[PDB]
Amino acid sequence: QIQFTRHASDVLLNLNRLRSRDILTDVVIVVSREQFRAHKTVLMACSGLFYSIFTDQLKRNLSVINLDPEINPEGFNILLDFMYTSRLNLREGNIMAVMATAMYLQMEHVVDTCRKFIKASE
Amino acid sequence: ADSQIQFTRHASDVLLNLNRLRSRDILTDVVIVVSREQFRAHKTVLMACSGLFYSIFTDQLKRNLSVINLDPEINPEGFNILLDFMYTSRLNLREGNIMAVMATAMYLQMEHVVDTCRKFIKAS
Ligand SMILES: C[C@H]1CN(C2COC2)CCN1c1cc(NC(=O)Cn2cc(-c3cc(Cl)c(O)c(C(N)=O)c3)c3c(=O)n(C)c(C(F)(F)F)nc32)c(Cl)cn1
Ligand SMILES: C[C@H]1CN(C2COC2)CCN1c1cc(NC(=O)Cn2cc(-c3cc(Cl)c(O)c(C(N)=O)c3)c3c(=O)n(C)c(C(F)(F)F)nc32)c(Cl)cn1
Ligand SMILES: [Cl-]
Ligand SMILES: [Cl-]
């Protein structure tokens, strides 16, 4: 069929615009003292943890999810921006936190990219 | 010591997973009614892909509606082609459907689809 090569990226951009305007967000993720509003569909599409949560009968209808308090909010922020943008901002000062947060969120390609960053920088 | 990494497959992988959720009726939040067919979807995806749906659901008086009735003169098969396009990036244009898809894309305010329809006509 006719393939629109920019369509998926344009969809994601528009989803990120909805998130910035707080339109149809349906969950708050709490990470220590920081709160992040998001769309469950995007979280589920991007994360094994969120897919498991929002397919679990006991948890799927929650509108507030408290993540492990040991997770670094900056690590989560970097990963949530990645979910909505395809762009992953890695630095020596954040790599360990992003990698551990990606393991927790079950984002395997992000973890592999973090390993590649360690290989390139250690 | 620093790197800004673009994941070139990420957006298409997100969209595939959204289509998987729709196919299982997970987190769908609206039924679009088009003449003799009902279609379930995610409002966020509809808004992301169509000027009409963007305008409808940005309106706070319509944002939380669970059923939207479209103009009854819209061809439901044209709509289904466009809904599948929204969730897949693939558009099935054929001589037997081009006029219906084009007219539906005008109504949904999907300009790059409309333009692709015009290119199809030009090449027919
Ligand atoms: C279950 C699956 C297959 N099933 C088939 C098999 O028989 C039928 C059809 C239904 N499918 C399905 C899956 C959905 N969501 C997920 O898969 C959640 N998800 C997302 C990712 C993910 C996505 C993108 Cl886009 C990325 O860029 C990256 C990255 N850069 O790291 C990571 C991911 C992951 O890395 N991992 C290990 C995992 C983990 F679970 F393995 F841990 N889960 C991840 C959604 Cl929403 C809807 N349907
Ligand atoms: C308004 C915009 C920019 N604004 C910036 C500018 O300063 C601040 C920020 C907020 N923004 C925003 C917009 C959102 N949604 C839409 O734009 C709706 N949408 C989507 C499309 C569209 C999208 C994809 Cl992916 C396609 O593949 C195709 C296609 N192949 O045809 C068509 C589309 C369109 O073609 N047309 C004419 C129109 C129309 F309205 F013009 F008619 N609307 C379309 C969403 Cl959800 C969230 N935020
Ligand atoms: Cl914006
Ligand atoms: Cl599948």
Query: CA-CA distances (angstroms) from residue A36 to A43, A48, A52, A83, B89?
Result: 12, 18, 19, 13, 29
Residue carrying the six token digits 């360690």: A118
Q: What are the angstrom distances between the C-alpha of B113 and each of A28, B40, B82, B106?
A: 35, 21, 9, 9
Give the domain range for residue A1: 1-122
Distance in angstroms (rounded) separating the CA atoms of residues A50 and B76: 34
- The interaxial angle of helices B98-108 and B51-58, nearest 10 deg, is 30
DSSP A23-90: -S--EEEEETTEEEEE-HHHHHHH-HHHHHHHT-TTTTT-SEEE--TTS-HHHHHHHHHHHHHSEEEE
What's the rounded Cα separation, in Å, for the pair B121 and B124? 5
Best substitution site from B107, B108, B111, B114 to test ligand 2's pocket, by max atoms within 8 Å of Cβ?
A: B111
The token duo for A79 is 């990963």
* Residues A68/A104, Cβ–Cβ less than 8 Å: yes
Count CB neighbours of B124 within 10 A: 8
Minimum-distance CB partner of A45 among B3, B17, B92: B17
What is the three-class DSSP state of A117? Answer: helix
Note the resolution in Å, 1 decimal: 1.5
User: In chain B, whose CA is at the least distance from the CA of A16?
Assistant: B48
Q: Which of A91, A92, A109 sits opposite B7 (nearest CB)?
A: A109
Residue A76: how many other CB atoms lie within 10 Å: 23
HEC-encoded secondary structure of B27-61:
CCCEEEEECCEEEEECHHHHHHHCHHHHHHHHCCC
Cα–Cα distances (Å) from A49 to A23, A97, B9, in that order, read 23, 17, 20
Q: How many Å apart are CA A47 and CA A38, to the nearest integer? A: 13
For residue B34, give Cα distances in angstroms to A91, A119, B26, B104: 50, 55, 21, 11
- Looking at the structure of chain B, the number of domains it has is 1
Q: How was this structure determined?
A: X-ray
Q: Among positive and negative, which fits the CA dihedral A114, A120, B1, B7? A: negative
| Distance between CA atoms of residues A110 and B5, nearest Å | 10
With tokens 């006509």, the residue in question is B121
**B97: β partners:** none
Beta-carbon neighbour count of residue B97 at 10 Å? 15
Q: How far apart are CA A39 and CA A52, in angstroms?
A: 15
Q: CB under 6 Å to ligand 2: residues?
A: A 4, 7, 10-11, 14, 17-18; B 47-51, 54, 109-113
What's CA A97's distance to the chain center, in Å? 14
DSSP string, chain B: -EEEEE-TTHHHHHHHHHHHHHHTT-S--EEEEETTEEEEE-HHHHHHH-HHHHHHHHSTTTTT-SEEEPPTTS-HHHHHHHHHHHHHSEE---TTTHHHHHHHHHHHT-HHHHHHHHHHHHH-
